[PDB]
Design a protein around this ligand. Structure first.
Ligand SMILES: Cc1cc2nc3c(=O)[nH]c(=O)nc-3n(C[C@H](O)[C@H](O)[C@H](O)COP(=O)(O)OP(=O)(O)OC[C@H]3O[C@@H](n4cnc5c(N)ncnc54)[C@H](O)[C@@H]3O)c2cc1C
Ligand SMILES: Cc1cc2nc3c(=O)[nH]c(=O)nc-3n(C[C@H](O)[C@H](O)[C@H](O)COP(=O)(O)OP(=O)(O)OC[C@H]3O[C@@H](n4cnc5c(N)ncnc54)[C@H](O)[C@@H]3O)c2cc1C
Lengths: 455, 455
């Protein structure tokens, strides 16, 4: 039998499988979709970043380039979508390559538990046994009952990656990362975009300061952002769709993207046959080693608690399989960055000010603006900042947060510093290339420690 | 009198002055040029990066943007140069702001030693005394006797930042960082550029594998690069200039940039009156705390040994003044990155393979290509790599090197890892955002340690 059977071939599942193979396990993977790579590769991170990177270049050329006159920039939607598809194709084929290289067996079908040690692949009729089972079934779009999604006029993120033309009017229901990113993609191509959010801010996982800054920037760019608004219905119409709000207001658009969250996905898994159940939010409860209540069955990624991120899922996959083989594993949740791939980028790592205040932890704030950065100035960027939060007594970095050009790339270093349990002093004293955006992080760190040089 | 008198207001001097004021010293600074910021801000890092960032965007638009049909792009050189000037001016005014904020006194003129403790500001006639003196006089372009520089047709980097029109043909004599960067700027604007280097490689401070890749990339972009050639004369002509090579070959061009290096600058300083002298290369010898042989006189930056980089100078400035006040101070030379701000960027930190082999240090190589990167592919980038060198016994990161889009940004993280004396395993295990160019570093690190997930 298998040593490890993995259900799902997303970031969590497929990386777990490769690591397990590296540890000497005989591994099988069941995935119901034809291509490997999960939500992230097929309809998530990869296609969305393809669209974001390319539209960003297009948008900047349309606004004008410093030192030049651009005579014309015409969207070529077939070419834009072809690039997206080619990037996805290359990535999924890469996972296939790595499975074959690492000797990982793959089954195509919906895995369903028969017992705690046996799983049916419903399509092939195969019954598979394993010593360890790793549930990595991911998530799915949350579709509230009031949202009548027809996958045409009222859509999820998947269809929003592939609109057959630019929507004259797009409404995004939900002010989270996914909807905002896709809102920006189509706004750059000429769509009038309106974002509706029930909560009193967008990007709720970010530090409040960063959420507020993000809203200002996107409004300046020309998106309409409306927080504190409860959508009561979304209904398709003949050649568009309407969005009803609490109080009677009705908005009309050509497409409406329903992006109010994602829910852990366990449909068709028959968890009950393994002696398992989901909690109130649909998650599979796990302990600190990612074991369910049945000790040889682990769960990771979007199907369990924690930030619904690809690299969160993969790190949990690594820790789970390392625990299976060695009896020890661990994920440093405080070193996992969360990034929004708009321009400017928006990011968070470690604790927000809100979380520190709630936990009663005393801290110092260090902040350095992009306006004081030589490199940012050189690029024609002036807006944004990075903020370092450090413990008031120990100087330990507790969190790093920012908004600005490439801030996600810059905060890669911040995540490393957190992983290294760095002090603000040590981050700020470390050499940083001049002139570079990393110097913004350096000065922010110095400011948290004591004082910066350049403020 | 002053506690500290600093000679030179470049990255070394001006940062040292701010740090010194922070430590409670009474500080004066003598600078002969009207504007503060030194070579770097006035005629170096800042103007060159302004030109590089802006021409990069113009050049991409000329080549075509993914998902668009782009018409021809028309250069506006007055607008390009206006941006450069505006960036420089904001940066030099920033230094003025910080001097005033920190209570640093400034003198305009050439400093010249009268004794070990007294310095004449020649143009104001002031005789200035100090407890500590910090020589941060920088460097100047190396002009070999065979190069007849008239600062019009045959020029240094300073004039090459401000050519009145795009030269139809530009020849760059010297294949180092500064010449290559400026060659690329004008090439993007339509110049036929030829780079001549005496050594058998360009970018001699890079890892040899990286130098070779750089040569291939720039040739493919359309630069002519000729290594192994000795220029024997450069002479201005009426409407151009000629470059003679050993053996009789003569090249002709509209402008010739002589960028064969920079030399430590101590002209007019009368070092001998301080009881000091320069070595054979023109450097001021210093000990491990940056003291000259006269222990209250320190020297830093381009005027002393080590990489001639702005952040190297400023770090030595911090270390020198922390030694004056506290008797501490430290510079981690192994963590200082050297970056070339072309596209793709080119970078090095810590030891090259050549240095490791020369020193007999056993090491492992880990390499991950941009071709395997999800984020890189989404951007339309496929070329380049990052390479991590780790000690064969201890797994200590010894060096990190790369070429690729934004590789300098990515290697900010590598510099931090080196500063923390971390292992390849430490770096490779750290969470990294997906999809991001930083994952290229992560996978290279894991490959150095043992094996990556994605190869
Ligand atoms: C548009 C969009 C953009 C995103 N952008 C980013 C981003 O840039 N960065 C980031 O970190 N995250 C991003 N995400 C989130 C990211 O996609 C998820 O966090 C990630 O995919 C979670 O990985 P996972 O392995 O837990 O689950 P998934 O990637 O969802 O994989 C689960 C797999 O399990 C399969 N499956 C489920 N049940 C069964 C069954 N019973 N039998 C067989 N197979 C089954 C599914 O077909 C699926 O392929 C984005 C998401 C969306 C939709
Ligand atoms: C075109 C170009 C591009 C560059 N790009 C980069 C890059 O992007 N990144 C990087 O790290 N480095 C770059 N550099 C190198 C960088 O400029 C130097 O490493 C840096 O300026 C060194 O700082 P410093 O303080 O030692 O000397 P400097 O910046 O040269 O400052 C010395 C100052 O001392 C003054 N001075 C000298 N003698 C006297 C005297 N006796 N009295 C009064 N004043 C005096 C000079 O006028 C000068 O302003 C570049 C250089 C060039 C020219």
């Amino acid at each position: 039998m298998y040593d490890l059977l993995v259900i799902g071939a997303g970031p969590g599942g497929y990386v777990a499988a490769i690591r397990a193979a590296q540890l000497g396990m005989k591994v099988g993977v069941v995935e119901k979709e034809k291509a490997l790579g999960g939500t992230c590769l097929r309809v998530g991170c990869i296609p969305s970043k393809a669209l974001l990177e390319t539209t960003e270049r297009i948008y900047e050329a349309k606004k004008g380039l410093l030192g030049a006159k651009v005579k014309g920039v015409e969207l070529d939607l077939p070419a834009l979508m072809a690039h997206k598809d080619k990037v996805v194709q290359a990535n999924t084929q890469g996972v296939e390559f790595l499975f074959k290289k690492n000797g990982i067996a793959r089954h195509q079908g919906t895995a369903r538990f028969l017992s705690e040690r046996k799983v049916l692949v419903e399509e092939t009729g195969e019954e598979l046994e394993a010593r360890y089972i790793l549930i990595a079934t991911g998530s799915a779009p949350l579709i509230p009952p009031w949202a009548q999604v027809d996958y045409e006029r009222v859509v999820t993120s998947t269809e929003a990656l592939s609109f057959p033309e630019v929507p004259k009017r797009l409404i995004v229901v939900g002010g989270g990362v996914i909807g905002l990113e896709l809102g920006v993609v189509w706004h750059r191509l000429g769509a009038e975009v309106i974002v509706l959010e029930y909560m009193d801010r967008i990007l709720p996982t970010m530090d409040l300061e960063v959420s507020r800054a993000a809203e200002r920037v996107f409004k300046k760019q020309g998106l309409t952002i409306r927080t504190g608004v409860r959508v009561t219905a979304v209904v398709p119409e003949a050649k568009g769709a309407r969005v009803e709000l609490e109080g009677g207001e009705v908005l009309e658009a050509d497409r409406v993207l329903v992006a109010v969250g994602r829910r852990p996905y366990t449909e068709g898994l028959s968890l009950e046959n393994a002696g398992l159940s989901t909690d109130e939010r649909g998650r599979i409860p796990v302990d600190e080693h990612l074991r369910t209540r049945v000790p040889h069955i682990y769960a990771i990624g979007d199907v369990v608690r924690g930030p619904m991120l690809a690299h969160k899922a993969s790190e949990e996959g690594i820790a789970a399989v390392e625990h299976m083989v060695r009896g020890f594993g661990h994920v440093d949740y405080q070193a996992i960055p969360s990034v929004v791939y708009t321009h400017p980028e928006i990011a968070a790592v470690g604790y927000t000010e809100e979380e520190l205040k709630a936990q009663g932890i005393p801290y110092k704030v260090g902040k350095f603006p992009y306006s004081a950065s030589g490199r940012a100035r050189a690029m024609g960027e002036t807006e944004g900042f990075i903020k370092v939060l450090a413990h008031a007594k120990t100087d330990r970095i507790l969190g790093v947060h920012g908004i600005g050009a490439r801030v996600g790339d810059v905060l890669a270093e911040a995540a490393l510093a957190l992983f290294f349990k760095a002090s603000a002093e040590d981050l700020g004293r470390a050499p940083h290339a001049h002139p570079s955006l990393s110097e913004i992080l350096k000065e922010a760190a110095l400011a948290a420690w004591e004082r910066p040089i350049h403020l």
